[PDB]
Ligand binder design. Sequence first.
Ligand SMILES: Nc1nc2c(ncn2[C@@H]2O[C@H](COP(=O)(O)OP(=O)(O)OP(=O)(O)O)[C@@H](O)[C@H]2O)c(=O)[nH]1
Ligand SMILES: Nc1nc2c(ncn2[C@@H]2O[C@H](COP(=O)(O)OP(=O)(O)OP(=O)(O)O)[C@@H](O)[C@H]2O)c(=O)[nH]1
Ligand SMILES: [Mg+2]
Ligand SMILES: [Mg+2]
Lengths: 166, 166
Amino acid sequence: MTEYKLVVVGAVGVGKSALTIQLIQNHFVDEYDPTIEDSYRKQVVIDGETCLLDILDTTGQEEYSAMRDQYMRTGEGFLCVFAINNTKSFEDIHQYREQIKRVKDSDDVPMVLVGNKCDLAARTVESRQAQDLARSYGIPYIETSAKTRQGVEDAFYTLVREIRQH
Amino acid sequence: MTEYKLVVVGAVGVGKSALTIQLIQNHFVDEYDPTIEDSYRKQVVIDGETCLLDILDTTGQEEYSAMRDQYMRTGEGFLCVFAINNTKSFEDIHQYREQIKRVKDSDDVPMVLVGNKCDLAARTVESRQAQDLARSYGIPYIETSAKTRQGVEDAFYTLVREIRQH
Ligand SMILES: Nc1nc2c(ncn2[C@@H]2O[C@H](COP(=O)(O)OP(=O)(O)OP(=O)(O)O)[C@@H](O)[C@H]2O)c(=O)[nH]1
Ligand SMILES: Nc1nc2c(ncn2[C@@H]2O[C@H](COP(=O)(O)OP(=O)(O)OP(=O)(O)O)[C@@H](O)[C@H]2O)c(=O)[nH]1
Ligand SMILES: [Mg+2]
Ligand SMILES: [Mg+2]
């Protein structure tokens, strides 16, 4: 079986666990409850091919210092998430792309910038500046919603395909 | 207003007009009725940006000989469609990628291979061989359905994004 090892990285509050749960469980997590490490494995079919999504929902702050590195070495593909109503969350996307290139010892890794929570209207991070960071890295930018599920299968699949053409 | 000039090319029978109508009208066209040229213009929002899809649904055989060339010069991005139950339709995708590179005078054009009609189970063109043609061209491969609408916004958006990062 073909498989893909997706790590979902980025800051606290953003909606890392509410996207992974929307995709693997089809319901929204309104409940506040933070993460250390979490593997979801689903058998899926993407463009008629049988694959196993082996996702590792993690975090963005703790005593996960460069203890972050162990998971980054082995993740084939990364989802980088920011929240569109959180200026700081967008600015720390650098800090994560720099050590995903440090532990991967390559400038080209399959990734996706994800401007999450896109149904709230207190946007602070324009689409224009997140679509400009994303083509500065040579990467996609997809906008998603975990309350709504719009954007979720788009994000996750765009990434899987990026892992296919590496 | 940002806009994108999408040409939908490929053979007869494949479902070029049933994808363009599914996206711009949300219903399936079961009815048999062939094409010469057709512009659909919709105002859409893709990853929070306002854009105009200015699609030009066309064909794959007629007295559209290299009269095909006039539209290919001006289309910013191409959807190449084959039907998964039609071996020949897949094999003429070459004939279309060669003159989209001839009139565009470039080897890199934003494109998408589209294995349409994916809900029928008389597949003849495996996913494995269409995912291998697609990474041979350095392009996406998305599988779609116009009876179902699965794959339709994925195909069209993946292409728009490909036009953004050129
Ligand atoms: N409205 C809105 N809220 C969201 C969205 N996704 C998540 N949230 C909310 O944002 C908060 C945090 O969600 P989580 O999914 O727990 O985010 P997280 O990034 O995993 O945070 P940690 O695992 O602690 O690092 C929760 O209160 C969710 O209900 C979204 O798309 N829109
Ligand atoms: N089951 C199935 N049939 C499809 C699909 N999309 C289109 N068809 C059928 O395939 C036939 C042709 O559809 P059109 O959408 O007219 O295809 P076309 O490529 O535009 O053909 P021309 O414009 O003549 O070149 C019709 O009989 C549709 O009902 C699909 O996803 N699945
Ligand atoms: Mg979490
Ligand atoms: Mg037609």
